[PDB]
Design a protein around this ligand. Structure first.
Ligand SMILES: *[C@@H]1O[C@H](CO)[C@@H](O[C@@H]2O[C@H](CO)[C@@H](O[C@@H]3O[C@H](CO)[C@@H](O)[C@H](O[C@H]4O[C@H](CO)[C@@H](O)[C@H](O)[C@@H]4O[C@H]4O[C@H](CO)[C@@H](O)[C@H](O)[C@@H]4O[C@H]4O[C@H](CO)[C@@H](O)[C@H](O)[C@@H]4O)[C@@H]3O)[C@H](O)[C@H]2NC(C)=O)[C@H](O)[C@H]1NC(C)=O
Ligand SMILES: *Cc1cc2c(nc3c(=O)[nH]c(=O)nc-3n2C[C@H](O)[C@H](O)[C@H](O)COP(=O)(O)OP(=O)(O)OC[C@H]2O[C@@H](n3cnc4c(N)ncnc43)[C@H](O)[C@@H]2O)c(*)c1C
Ligand SMILES: COc1ccc(C[C@H]2c3cc(O)c(OC)cc3CCN2C)cc1O
Ligand SMILES: *[C@@H]1O[C@H](CO)[C@@H](O)[C@H](O)[C@H]1NC(C)=O
Length: 500
């Protein structure tokens, strides 16, 4: 379905002047803006789905009207903030679709009196973090480490980061927000009601409508926090020992502490990158690990004291705090597919050993280990759609990324990742095998919203990944879905089905 004169005239009429139409060209602005926020080259392929038009609204009413104009046609709506969807569900779709890029909605309004902020859904974590440190040295916010990840889909799915052990997810700290429904109705928390305002805070993106802006509570942070990023080159024996003890240390640390691990291997050596964050000074930080985790062999020089801003930039591997404010800094430029696990029981050494052995078989693979507990276990499972709280111990994350040179090995890389996930099945959560909506996994299945045979059973088919992402909260998400989008205008392969 083309993007005809009706759609365009509708946009022109409504003052939404920033938009381009599909172009087979490569030198075109369309293709440029399209590939501008494709954060997973896995989907840069010339055979993937491409929008009939890309619209870049610059205000909440332009956003409202954009949705209104698209509703006059049959197009599927696709919202994009940072475009970091692991499945590229913000710039792809089986059916002809319109791409609503929210990058022009990147304003952060910080209020130092209430210590809250109105973050436009276009604003990325980085641009947000920058705004906060630009305004205060005693304020921060909890969310992912990826500075290019947009708050649009990030906070919509939850938002887990290095401070979540201290403050919970991003969505755990949303006090208000502006959602724009299928009719372009501009709704605040009071207008949308509690069932929906609850849903949008971890229920997923591209499901409830277009978040125009988030109102977050800004969080206290000492003017000096401590972090370390130390890569240990060890053998598999030591690596297992370190990982096996890590899970306990990491999960049982005080909320003022976060210890995350990035593991990979290559035949000979196993490399474990230790990412440390302390909600306080260096001496206390080092004292703690010197006691709890002396095996890391971390030294004084390893611990860096810096502002909270400097720390989230440092942790993200950025050169400077200014780079937090750069939304177009690709952090790898490599295609990838990532599966995640959540643990209820501790993991046997054999699990880390197996993981490390499997890793040593494929250098392009690597695991990310995150501890829960602390503040994550104090927030109710039903406080927000994100269920995994008290009881959840670790977030294990299996990634595999490659170069354009290695595009041929594609299927092989995915094969490895499939083998690793299968290998971990006994050691992780079961019935259901839990997942995280911001780590959306189309392998868990999907829904063909064009197939009425399936659409009639959308809720049960969706159960597979639904209870996996949201567990018991899945029920309330369906009531909330029916209230704000019964027509299922906002959908994607793993969107919450409305009651029909
Ligand atoms: C649809 O949405 C898309 C996405 O948002 C829009 O595309 C964006 O369009 C932006 C402009 O509208 C564009 O910003 C540009 O970014 C470049 C860097 O790539 C930047 O250099 C440009 O900024 C200059 O120009 C603007 C005005 O055009 C000035 O306000 C600004 O101060 C900059 O001018 C200064 O630097 C220039 C060289 O960098 C000098 O030539 C100029 O003289 C001036 O220098 C003075 O100021 C300096 C610093 O203050 C000082 O050192 C010096 O001595 C002088 O005093 C430009 O803004 C984005 O690149 C683009 N974004 C993307 C992702 O493509 C698009 O516009 C929308 N479409 C529609 C229809 O609206
Ligand atoms: C690329 C990348 C992803 C990361 C990174 N680090 C993460 C981390 O530290 N913790 C995590 O929890 N997740 C991490 N991820 C994955 C991201 O969390 C997810 O990819 C988030 O969805 C990020 O959102 P965004 O960058 O905006 O991706 P989009 O593709 O634009 O959107 C995702 C999803 O949400 C819908 N959507 C977008 N915008 C809106 C608005 N404003 N309103 C409602 N819904 C919206 C889209 O349709 C899409 O379906 C580290 C890196 C490098
Ligand atoms: C501190 O905790 C973590 C640290 C790093 C990661 C991996 C990171 C990533 C880093 C890459 O370089 C990359 O290459 C394509 C892909 C990805 C996919 C997931 N993304 C989030 C996950 C974590 O949970
Ligand atoms: C509709 O869904 C069912 C179940 O997946 C499938 O068997 C059938 O082929 C689908 N029909 C269409 C329209 O493709």
């Amino acid at each position: 379905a083309e993007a005809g004169n009706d759609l365009l005239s509708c946009l022109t009429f409504n003052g939404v002047r920033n938009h381009t139409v599909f172009s087979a060209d490569s030198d075109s602005d369309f293709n440029r803006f399209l590939h501008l926020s494709i954060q997973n080259p896995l989907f840069q392929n010339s055979l993937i789905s491409k929008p009939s038009a890309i619209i870049l609204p610059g205000s909440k009413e332009e956003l409202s009207n954009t949705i209104r104009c698209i509703r006059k046609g049959s197009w599927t709506i696709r919202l994009r903030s940072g475009g970091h969807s692991y499945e590229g569900l913000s710039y792809t779709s089986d059916t002809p679709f319109i791409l609503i890029d929210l990058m022009n909605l990147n304003r952060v309004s910080i209020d130092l009196e209430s210590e809250t902020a109105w973050v436009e859904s276009g604003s990325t974590l980085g641009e947000l973090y920058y705004a906060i440190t630009e305004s205060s040295s005693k304020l921060g916010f909890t969310a992912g480490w990826c500075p290019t990840v947009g708050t649009g889909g990030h906070i919509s799915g939850g938002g887990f980061g290095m401070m979540s052990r201290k403050y919970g997810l991003a969505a755990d700290n949303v006090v208000d927000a502006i959602l724009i429904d299928a009719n372009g109705a501009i709704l605040d928390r009071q207008a949308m009601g509690e069932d929906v305002f609850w849903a949008i805070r971890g229920g997923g993106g591209g499901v409830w409508g277009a978040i125009y802006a988030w109102k977050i509570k800004l969080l206290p942070v000492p003017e000096k926090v401590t972090v370390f990023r130390v890569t240990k080159n060890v053998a598999i024996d030591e690596a297992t020992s370190l990982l096996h003890k890590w899970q306990f240390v990491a999960e049982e640390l005080e909320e003022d502490f976060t210890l995350s691990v990035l593991g990979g291997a290559d035949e000979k050596q196993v490399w474990l990158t230790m990412l440390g964050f302390h909600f306080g000074l260096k001496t206390v930080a080092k004292s703690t690990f010197d006691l709890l985790f002396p095996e890391l062999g971390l030294v004084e020089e390893d611990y860096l004291e810096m502002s909270w801003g400097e720390s989230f930039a440092y942790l993200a591997g950025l050169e400077t705090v200014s780079q937090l404010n750069n939304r177009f800094l690709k952090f790898d430029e490599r295609a990838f597919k990532t599966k995640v696990d959540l643990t209820k029981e501790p993991l046997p050494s054999k699990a880390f050993y197996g993981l490390l052995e499997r890793l040593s078989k494929e250098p392009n693979g690597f695991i990310a280990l995150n501890g829960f507990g602390g503040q994550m276990s104090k927030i109710s499972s039903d406080f927000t759609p994100f269920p995994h709280r008290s009881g959840t111990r670790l977030m294990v994350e299996y990634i595999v990324a490659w170069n354009q040179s290695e595009q041929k090995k594609k299927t092989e890389f995915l094969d490895w990742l499939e083998k690793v996930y299968e290998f971990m099945k006994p050691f992780v959560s079961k019935n259901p095998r839990l997942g995280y909506v911001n780590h959306i996994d189309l392998d868990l299945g999907g829904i063909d919203w064009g197939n009425k045979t399936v659409v009639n059973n959308a809720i049960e088919i969706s159960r597979s990944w639904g209870e996996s992402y949201f567990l018991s909260n899945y029920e309330r998400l369906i009531r909330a879905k029916t209230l704000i989008d019964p027509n299922n205008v906002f959908n994607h392969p793993q969107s919450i089905p409305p009651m029909a």
